[PDB]
Design a protein around this ligand. Structure first.
Ligand SMILES: *[C@@H]1O[C@H](CO)[C@@H](O)[C@H](O)[C@H]1NC(C)=O
Lengths: 34, 50
């Protein structure tokens, strides 16, 4: 039941609720994976 | 620029650097092993005889 979220075009830091395990890719920013 | 209204572009799955690798692989096989690598393992053969 674990998931992950991808944000389309953000410089991840307009995101509101973020903890650890952040990562920025060419497509966007992804939180929930290492 | 300025993204106008709510329209996006999205990126392709395979980047251009990876595509160039695939074409280079085909050149190596046909120069060295002829057409043998299209079916089963590759076998070497001298070019003038090929
Ligand atoms: C994103 O933020 C970093 C640090 O705030 C900045 O250096 C960069 O220019 C910004 N934009 C992109 C596309 O990385």
């Amino acid at each position: 039941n674990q998931v992950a979220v991808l944000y389309q075009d953000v410089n991840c830091w307009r995101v509101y609720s973020t903890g650890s395990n952040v990562f920025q890719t060419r497509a966007g920013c992804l939180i929930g994976a290492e | 620029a300025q993204k106008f209204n709510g329209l996006t572009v999205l990126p392709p799955l395979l980047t251009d650097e990876m595509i160039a690798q695939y074409t280079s692989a085909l050149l190596a096989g046909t120069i060295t092993s002829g057409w043998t690598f299209g079916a089963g393992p590759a076998l070497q053969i001298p070019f003038p005889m090929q």
